[PDB]
Design a protein around this ligand. Structure first.
Ligand SMILES: CCCCCCCCCCCCO[C@@H]1O[C@H](CO)[C@@H](O[C@H]2O[C@H](CO)[C@@H](O)[C@H](O)[C@H]2O)[C@H](O)[C@H]1O
Ligand SMILES: CCCCCCCCCCCCO[C@@H]1O[C@H](CO)[C@@H](O[C@H]2O[C@H](CO)[C@@H](O)[C@H](O)[C@H]2O)[C@H](O)[C@H]1O
Ligand SMILES: *CCS(=O)(=O)N1CN(S(=O)(=O)CC*)CN(S(=O)(=O)CC*)C1
Ligand SMILES: CCCCCCCCCCCCCCCC(=O)O
Lengths: 15, 151, 563
């Protein structure tokens, strides 16, 4: 539920 | 980075043909809503047409308020806040009636020395809020479609 | 209906302005569509009864309210103005609104007072001590689906005795025509004829005629949109009574002026979507880039007096607006591109939970109206000059926060900003915090010079407000508000309200301390205290509320719902 993912998210960071 | 172009229309496919109904069909809100629906490729019908299974969009009360948001050291108004509230409803004929709303916030500074000018500014702001209140309502159409499928 | 007409319950209040005040209302049911009220309002300090007459009506043309307050004499005003022959104080108010046959639109918003200090002395029912002027508008319009023509007159009674000169449109005619399927284009024509008159006899009078045809090409996709627009502006000015201004100003006003200008606008928008599974299952994010190129040639408008053009505030929505000024006396030249971006969040139910926007305006050339009297803090003319940001977060069902910020590099400081966080369980249970800011540089740039030199204006705005409302035992309702200016470290407005509601009656007690004026003899602010007591009879109607929203709007900075 990390809300700060809005301004930074990248699919391969997850996996 | 995960982004893709929107592959779905802003207006849901079942709402591509609909009836726009209001008690003030020639008013400014109705004009704004009709223009926004025309921009999205929506076919608007008259309320007397015989086509059925056509969702209806009934616009309701519109309230515009002008209040004092801040004051100077002498107690005179510095900033006016204008509030637009629009209540509408969507009737899906077989299913159900879903109500939606829109609230628009704008502000502008006062100037007693240029009161006439300020009045025109106010008018322009109102003309904008209607448009801002229209896109808001169309933006809630996909939410209605999702609620329709859920029930 | 003599059965339904009679005396209401008297209410009272103690004020610092008028000491003990006493109202004795009398309701009168003339008809099922027309009702009236007569209220003797005795003020002790002025030692006299002022008569309030209120009249509501519903007709075919719409619904309206008339109000007339008359005070034959006033001891306080007589003391403050010995030279005046009479100390009578009156107010006339008329508000009518209606649409008849769906085509005729009738609007009246008229206020007139006997003296500028009326609202600082008497209670604020159809006005306020916060207003700097009184407005008098009449408008009759005819509007069908593709046409509308409105004739209106606007007048203003300015209160502050710095410069009581004010321009009026007597009358103003507005005509709009629309076409939508002429080929692939959309077309509209806007016409206007106006006549500006002034209160003083030495200021210019004008007649303006304006024509404006626009043609636009919209193109749309599921993910993108681009709208091109070509607009034409043709204005004709006939100005008279120019001897005074020309004899005192170095730039000369011209009798006959013609102003012809093209305008080209290109607007484009894209929508990107992505899946945000880390927030919660089903949530999605949307990115919305928007760009707009605006080009308006430069015409020197120094020979036209500025009658009704004022600087427009540039929030995020106003970044993409194609005008710098309101009205039509100042059309700024433009060679600019506006770039902005909006991010939105939806849940599994496709409901917007959060949105944030940021944008800027890049000027390729300086915007000129021929005359430029705006006092900037630096000589920046081109580049990224204006920035605006907006945000709205619906944290939960009972929480919500809003924010907006404006930055101007020519001010070398944030121009204006505002924020508000509100908890609202229900119309009786709520808490709200809000903040308003306006830099002194912004006041200097966008307001007259004596605002920059006057103590009560020059420091800008830095205001923090708190509003709270809490019921007890379903019968009581406590309401409070407090507004504090951090620049002066002084109270601006505070309110307290307690209402006891029962089956047959409701008793309201309210206190308020507000900024009421400015005393320039030793240069401080003047406050006013008011403690009121009011009883109203229940049961006759369907209203059973605790009255919280009524007391929340009773102060000079009324509460507004922001979710
Ligand atoms: C002040 C400047 C701007 C500040 C910027 C802050 C940006 C924050 C963006 C928040 C976006 C939406 O935030 C999202 O809210 C929802 C709704 O409660 C939370 O979701 C939560 O409640 C929902 C609804 O009951 C549950 O289904 C979910 O399991 C739970 O986590 C998400 O965990 C959070 O990610
Ligand atoms: C990018 C998207 C933005 C989303 C919306 C963000 C909303 C932000 C709301 C900001 C609320 C606080 O508002 C902020 O108040 C402070 C404190 O007075 C002002 O800051 C001020 O501080 C002191 C004076 O007090 C000066 O030294 C400074 O130069 C001046 O700016 C800010 O200019 C204003 O922005
Ligand atoms: C803000 C989300 S992130 O920076 O891209 N991030 C990547 N992952 S993930 O959120 O699990 C992507 C599915 C790991 N983290 S996190 O700790 O899980 C963020 C709450 C960072
Ligand atoms: C502002 C313009 C935003 C452009 C978004 C491009 C999306 C595709 C690249 C990122 C992913 O990967």
């Amino acid at each position: 539920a990390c809300e700060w993912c809005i301004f930074w998210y990248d699919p391969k960071l997850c996996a | 980075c995960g982004w893709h172009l929107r592959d779905t229309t802003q207006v849901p496919s079942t709402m591509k043909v609909m009836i726009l109904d209001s008690g003030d069909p020639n008013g400014p809100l109705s004009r704004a809503v009709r223009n926004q629906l025309r921009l999205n490729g929506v076919e608007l019908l008259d309320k007397e047409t015989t086509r059925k299974d056509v969702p209806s969009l009934r616009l309701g009360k519109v309230s515009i308020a002008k209040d004092t948001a801040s004051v100077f050291r002498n107690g005179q108004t510095a900033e006016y806040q204008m509030i637009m509230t629009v209540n509408a409803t969507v009737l899906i004929p077989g299913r159900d009636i879903y109500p939606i709303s829109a609230k628009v916030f704008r502000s502008f500074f006062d100037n007693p020395q240029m009161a006439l000018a300020k009045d025109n500014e106010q008018d322009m702001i109102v003309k904008e809020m209607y448009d801002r209140a229209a896109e808001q309502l169309i933006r809630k159409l996909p939410s209605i479609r999702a609620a329709d499928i859920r029930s | 209906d003599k059965r339904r007409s009679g005396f209401l319950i008297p209410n009272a209040k103690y004020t610092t302005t008028n000491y003990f005040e006493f109202y004795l209302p009398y309701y009168w049911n003339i008809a099922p569509n027309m009702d009236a009220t007569i209220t003797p309002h005795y003020m002790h300090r002025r030692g006299n009864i002022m008569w309030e007459n209120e009249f509501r009506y519903l007709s075919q043309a719409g619904a309206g309210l008339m109000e007339l307050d008359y005070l034959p004499s006033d001891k306080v005003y007589e003391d403050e103005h010995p030279n005046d022959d009479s100390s009578r104080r009156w107010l006339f108010y008329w508000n009518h609104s209606g649409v008849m046959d769906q085509v005729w639109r009738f609007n009246v918003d008229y206020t007139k007072v006997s003296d500028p200090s009326y609202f600082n002395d008497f209670d604020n029912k159809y006005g306020s001590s916060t207003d700097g002027y009184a407005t008098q508008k009449f408008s009759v319009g005819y509007a069908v689906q593709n046409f509308n023509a409105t004739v209106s007159t606007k007048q203003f009674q300015v209160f502050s005795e710095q410069n009581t000169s004010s321009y009026s449109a007597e009358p103003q005619l507005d005509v709009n025509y629309y076409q939508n399927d002429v080929g692939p284009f959309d077309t509209r024509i806007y016409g206007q004829a106006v006549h500006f008159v002034n209160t003083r006899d030495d200021m210019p009078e004008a007649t303006r005629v304006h024509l404006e045809p626009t043609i636009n090409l919209p193109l749309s996709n599921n993910w993108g949109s681009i709208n091109t627009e070509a607009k034409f502006l043709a204005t004709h000015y006939q100005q008279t009574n120019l001897d005074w201004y020309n004899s005192r100003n170095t730039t000369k006003l011209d009798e006959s002026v013609n102003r012809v200008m093209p305008q080209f606008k290109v607007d484009g928008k894209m929508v990107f979507e992505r899946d945000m599974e880390m927030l919660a299952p089903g949530y999605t994010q949307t990115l919305e880039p928007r760009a707009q190129y605006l080009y308006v040639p430069y015409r020197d408008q120094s020979d036209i007096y500025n009658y009704d053009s004022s600087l427009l505030q540039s929030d995020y929505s106003g970044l993409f607006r194609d005008r710098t000024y309101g009205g039509l006396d100042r059309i700024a030249s433009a060679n600019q591109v506006t770039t902005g971006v909006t991010s939105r969040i939806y849940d599994d139910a496709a409901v917007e939970r959060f949105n944030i926007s940021v944008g800027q305006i890049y000027y390729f050339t300086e915007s000129r109206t021929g005359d430029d009297n705006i006092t900037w803090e630096n000589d920046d003319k081109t580049g990224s000059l204006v920035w605006a940001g907006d945000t709205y977060w619906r944290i939960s069902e009972r929480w919500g926060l809003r924010g907006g910020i404006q930055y101007d590099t020519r001010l070398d400081n944030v121009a204006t900003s505002n924020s508000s966080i509100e908890y609202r369980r229900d119309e009786d249970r709520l808490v709200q915090l809000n903040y308003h800011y306006a830099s002194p540089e912004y006041i200097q740039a966008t307001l007259p010079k004596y605002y920059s030199t006057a103590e009560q204006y020059k420091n800008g705005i830095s205001q923090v407000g708190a509003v709270a409302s809490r019921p007890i035992a379903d019968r009581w309702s406590i309401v409070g508000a407090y507004y504090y200016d951090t620049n002066a470290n002084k109270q601006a407005d505070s309110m307290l309200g307690v209402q006891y509601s029962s089956c047959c009656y409701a008793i309201r007690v309210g206190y308020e301390r507000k900024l009421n004026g400015w005393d320039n003899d030793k240069q401080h602010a003047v406050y006013d205290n008011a403690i009121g007591f009011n009883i109203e009879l229940r049961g006759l109607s369907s209203n059973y509320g605790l009255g919280t929203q009524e007391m929340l709007r009773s102060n000079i900075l009324p509460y507004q719902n922001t979710l």
